[model samples]
Target: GVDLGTENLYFQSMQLYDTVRSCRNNQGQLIAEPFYHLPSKKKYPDYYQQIKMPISLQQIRTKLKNQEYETLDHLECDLNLMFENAKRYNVPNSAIYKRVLKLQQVMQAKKKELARRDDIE
Candidate 1:
Protein backbone atom coordinates (compact mmCIF):
# COMPACT_ATOMS: atom_id res chain seq x y z
CA GLY A 1 0.00 0.00 0.00
CA VAL A 2 0.88 3.70 0.19
CA ASP A 3 1.39 6.16 3.07
CA LEU A 4 1.41 9.97 3.64
CA GLY A 5 2.32 11.59 6.95
CA THR A 6 5.01 13.51 8.90
CA GLU A 7 6.14 10.61 11.05
CA ASN A 8 6.41 8.58 7.91
CA LEU A 9 8.33 11.52 6.41
CA TYR A 10 11.01 11.77 9.11
CA PHE A 11 13.33 9.29 10.78
CA GLN A 12 12.48 6.28 8.69
CA SER A 13 11.32 8.57 5.90
CA MET A 14 13.57 11.68 5.94
CA GLN A 15 11.06 13.48 3.74
CA LEU A 16 9.87 16.34 5.98
CA TYR A 17 11.46 18.95 3.74
CA ASP A 18 10.44 22.37 2.45
CA THR A 19 11.52 24.37 5.46
CA VAL A 20 9.20 27.10 4.15
CA ARG A 21 6.20 24.83 4.44
CA SER A 22 4.05 24.91 7.52
CA CYS A 23 4.60 22.08 9.99
CA ARG A 24 0.91 22.06 10.73
CA ASN A 25 -2.57 22.98 9.45
CA ASN A 26 -5.31 25.64 10.06
CA GLN A 27 -7.68 23.46 12.08
CA GLY A 28 -4.86 23.56 14.64
CA GLN A 29 -3.00 20.47 13.44
CA LEU A 30 0.65 19.51 13.02
CA ILE A 31 0.14 15.98 11.87
CA ALA A 32 1.17 17.03 8.36
CA GLU A 33 4.57 18.61 8.86
CA PRO A 34 5.48 16.40 11.76
CA PHE A 35 9.03 15.88 10.49
CA TYR A 36 11.90 18.09 9.29
CA HIS A 37 15.08 17.91 7.20
CA LEU A 38 18.56 18.93 8.34
CA PRO A 39 20.92 20.73 5.95
CA SER A 40 23.96 19.07 7.48
CA LYS A 41 22.41 15.63 7.22
CA LYS A 42 20.40 16.45 4.10
CA LYS A 43 17.68 14.22 5.54
CA TYR A 44 14.90 14.18 8.08
CA PRO A 45 15.36 13.06 11.65
CA ASP A 46 13.26 10.99 13.97
CA TYR A 47 10.16 12.65 15.39
CA TYR A 48 9.43 12.74 19.11
CA GLN A 49 7.49 9.63 20.02
CA GLN A 50 5.37 11.66 22.41
CA ILE A 51 5.12 14.77 20.22
CA LYS A 52 1.80 13.96 18.66
CA MET A 53 1.97 16.11 15.50
CA PRO A 54 -1.76 16.84 15.71
CA ILE A 55 -1.39 18.50 19.12
CA SER A 56 2.23 19.72 19.38
CA LEU A 57 1.89 21.26 15.89
CA GLN A 58 0.19 24.24 17.57
CA GLN A 59 3.18 24.98 19.76
CA ILE A 60 5.42 25.53 16.68
CA ARG A 61 2.75 27.07 14.45
CA THR A 62 3.38 30.67 15.53
CA LYS A 63 7.14 30.42 15.18
CA LEU A 64 7.04 28.64 11.82
CA LYS A 65 4.80 31.43 10.58
CA ASN A 66 7.86 33.66 10.58
CA GLN A 67 10.43 31.37 8.96
CA GLU A 68 12.43 32.28 5.79
CA TYR A 69 11.98 31.13 2.20
CA GLU A 70 15.27 29.30 1.87
CA THR A 71 14.22 27.12 4.78
CA LEU A 72 10.90 26.37 3.14
CA ASP A 73 12.54 25.44 -0.15
CA HIS A 74 14.82 23.02 1.59
CA LEU A 75 11.95 21.43 3.46
CA GLU A 76 9.88 21.09 0.32
CA CYS A 77 12.77 19.37 -1.39
CA ASP A 78 13.45 17.19 1.60
CA LEU A 79 9.81 16.32 2.11
CA ASN A 80 9.81 15.06 -1.45
CA LEU A 81 11.99 12.17 -0.40
CA MET A 82 9.02 10.49 1.24
CA PHE A 83 8.40 8.86 -2.12
CA GLU A 84 11.25 6.54 -1.33
CA ASN A 85 9.76 5.31 1.93
CA ALA A 86 7.07 3.77 -0.23
CA LYS A 87 9.68 1.44 -1.68
CA ARG A 88 11.93 0.81 1.33
CA TYR A 89 9.62 0.53 4.34
CA ASN A 90 6.83 -0.82 2.14
CA VAL A 91 3.39 -0.65 3.80
CA PRO A 92 -0.28 -0.71 2.94
CA ASN A 93 -2.08 2.58 2.31
CA SER A 94 -4.87 1.65 4.71
CA ALA A 95 -2.50 1.80 7.68
CA ILE A 96 -1.57 5.45 7.23
CA TYR A 97 -5.03 6.65 6.23
CA LYS A 98 -5.91 8.26 9.55
CA ARG A 99 -2.51 9.90 10.12
CA VAL A 100 -2.38 11.15 6.51
CA LEU A 101 -5.65 13.09 6.90
CA LYS A 102 -4.44 14.63 10.13
CA LEU A 103 -1.50 16.33 8.42
CA GLN A 104 -2.85 16.68 4.88
CA GLN A 105 -4.03 20.29 5.29
CA VAL A 106 -0.76 21.36 6.85
CA MET A 107 1.38 19.41 4.39
CA GLN A 108 -0.38 20.74 1.29
CA ALA A 109 -1.62 24.16 2.47
CA LYS A 110 1.36 26.13 1.19
CA LYS A 111 -0.53 28.77 -0.82
CA LYS A 112 -2.26 30.08 2.32
CA GLU A 113 -0.01 29.92 5.39
CA LEU A 114 3.56 31.13 5.65
CA ALA A 115 6.65 29.04 6.36
CA ARG A 116 7.31 27.54 9.80
CA ARG A 117 10.27 28.01 12.17
CA ASP A 118 12.93 25.37 12.63
CA ASP A 119 14.85 24.39 15.75
CA ILE A 120 16.78 21.56 14.13
CA GLU A 121 18.32 23.66 11.38
Candidate 2:
Protein backbone atom coordinates (compact mmCIF):
# COMPACT_ATOMS: atom_id res chain seq x y z
CA GLY A 1 0.00 0.00 0.00
CA VAL A 2 3.09 2.27 0.32
CA ASP A 3 6.46 2.80 -1.24
CA LEU A 4 8.21 1.66 1.90
CA GLY A 5 11.85 0.88 1.19
CA THR A 6 14.94 -0.30 2.98
CA GLU A 7 15.09 0.45 6.67
CA ASN A 8 18.41 2.19 6.27
CA LEU A 9 17.18 4.39 3.46
CA TYR A 10 13.90 5.11 5.21
CA PHE A 11 15.57 6.09 8.49
CA GLN A 12 18.23 8.07 6.69
CA SER A 13 15.48 10.01 5.02
CA MET A 14 13.86 10.98 8.30
CA GLN A 15 14.85 14.05 10.32
CA LEU A 16 18.30 14.06 11.94
CA TYR A 17 19.34 17.66 12.33
CA ASP A 18 22.72 18.60 13.88
CA THR A 19 23.88 21.12 16.48
CA VAL A 20 27.11 22.79 17.63
CA ARG A 21 25.83 23.41 21.12
CA SER A 22 27.30 21.37 23.97
CA CYS A 23 25.49 17.98 23.97
CA ARG A 24 26.70 16.29 27.13
CA ASN A 25 24.68 16.06 30.33
CA ASN A 26 25.79 16.23 33.97
CA GLN A 27 26.09 12.45 34.25
CA GLY A 28 28.25 12.58 31.14
CA GLN A 29 25.44 11.49 28.85
CA LEU A 30 25.68 12.57 25.22
CA ILE A 31 22.96 13.56 22.72
CA ALA A 32 22.41 12.85 19.04
CA GLU A 33 23.09 15.67 16.61
CA PRO A 34 22.16 15.90 12.96
CA PHE A 35 25.34 16.59 11.04
CA TYR A 36 23.57 17.22 7.72
CA HIS A 37 20.05 17.34 6.41
CA LEU A 38 18.98 15.31 3.40
CA PRO A 39 16.37 16.34 0.90
CA SER A 40 13.99 13.94 -0.79
CA LYS A 41 10.97 13.73 -3.01
CA LYS A 42 9.72 10.96 -0.75
CA LYS A 43 6.66 11.58 1.38
CA TYR A 44 5.65 9.71 4.50
CA PRO A 45 2.85 7.30 3.81
CA ASP A 46 -0.72 8.16 4.72
CA TYR A 47 -0.71 5.23 7.13
CA TYR A 48 2.09 3.69 9.19
CA GLN A 49 2.81 -0.04 8.98
CA GLN A 50 5.50 -1.53 11.22
CA ILE A 51 5.79 -4.74 9.25
CA LYS A 52 6.38 -2.70 6.17
CA MET A 53 9.03 -0.50 7.80
CA PRO A 54 10.89 -3.14 9.85
CA ILE A 55 13.17 -0.50 11.37
CA SER A 56 14.79 -0.80 14.76
CA LEU A 57 15.24 2.34 16.84
CA GLN A 58 17.79 0.56 19.05
CA GLN A 59 20.58 2.64 17.55
CA ILE A 60 18.52 5.72 18.30
CA ARG A 61 19.83 5.61 21.88
CA THR A 62 23.37 6.11 20.68
CA LYS A 63 22.18 8.76 18.28
CA LEU A 64 20.36 10.47 21.11
CA LYS A 65 23.62 10.57 23.01
CA ASN A 66 25.14 12.84 20.37
CA GLN A 67 22.04 14.81 19.30
CA GLU A 68 21.70 18.53 20.07
CA TYR A 69 18.95 21.12 20.16
CA GLU A 70 18.89 24.89 20.65
CA THR A 71 16.16 24.80 23.27
CA LEU A 72 14.18 22.30 25.28
CA ASP A 73 11.12 23.28 23.31
CA HIS A 74 12.98 22.67 20.09
CA LEU A 75 14.29 19.35 21.33
CA GLU A 76 10.86 18.32 22.53
CA CYS A 77 9.33 19.23 19.23
CA ASP A 78 11.65 16.98 17.29
CA LEU A 79 11.45 14.12 19.75
CA ASN A 80 7.70 14.45 19.83
CA LEU A 81 7.62 14.20 16.08
CA MET A 82 9.76 11.11 16.18
CA PHE A 83 7.75 9.54 18.96
CA GLU A 84 4.49 10.29 17.25
CA ASN A 85 5.70 8.71 14.06
CA ALA A 86 7.21 5.77 15.87
CA LYS A 87 3.93 5.09 17.61
CA ARG A 88 2.03 5.24 14.37
CA TYR A 89 4.66 2.96 12.91
CA ASN A 90 3.98 0.52 15.75
CA VAL A 91 7.55 0.79 16.97
CA PRO A 92 7.94 -0.91 20.34
CA ASN A 93 7.27 1.25 23.37
CA SER A 94 10.29 -0.10 25.28
CA ALA A 95 12.51 0.83 22.39
CA ILE A 96 11.30 4.42 22.28
CA TYR A 97 10.52 5.12 25.94
CA LYS A 98 14.06 4.85 27.25
CA ARG A 99 15.30 7.20 24.61
CA VAL A 100 12.55 9.60 25.57
CA LEU A 101 13.85 9.69 29.13
CA LYS A 102 17.38 10.29 27.94
CA LEU A 103 16.22 13.00 25.58
CA GLN A 104 14.37 14.67 28.41
CA GLN A 105 17.49 14.76 30.55
CA VAL A 106 19.63 16.18 27.76
CA MET A 107 17.12 18.92 26.94
CA GLN A 108 16.50 19.85 30.56
CA ALA A 109 20.21 20.05 31.30
CA LYS A 110 20.88 22.20 28.25
CA LYS A 111 17.96 24.45 29.12
CA LYS A 112 19.32 24.93 32.65
CA GLU A 113 22.77 25.75 31.32
CA LEU A 114 21.33 28.39 29.06
CA ALA A 115 19.40 29.90 31.91
CA ARG A 116 22.52 29.95 34.07
CA ARG A 117 24.46 31.68 31.33
CA ASP A 118 21.73 34.26 30.92
CA ASP A 119 21.82 35.01 34.64
CA ILE A 120 25.60 35.32 34.54
CA GLU A 121 25.43 37.87 31.73
Q: Kindly give the number of clashing pairs for every candidate.
A: 17, 11
Query: For residues 1-121, could you state the per-residue lDDT of candidate 1 as single tens digits?
Result: 3554333323221223342234544565554443333112223233223222222223233333444223444444333344233223334465344444444444445422432322222
TM-score of 2: 0.32
Which whole-number lDDT from 0 to 100 does residue 81 have in model 1? 40
Give stretches of model 1 more than 4 Å off. 1-69, 83-88, 101-105, 110-112, 115-121
- Model 1, residue 100: C-alpha shift (Å): 3.7
Root mean square deviation (Cα) for candidate 1 = 14.8
lDDT of 1 at 36: 37
Measured with C-alpha atoms, the lDDT of residue 41 in candidate 1 is 23
* Model 2 Cα lDDT, one tens digit per residue, 56-110: 2333334444543333344445544554444554445664455445554655554
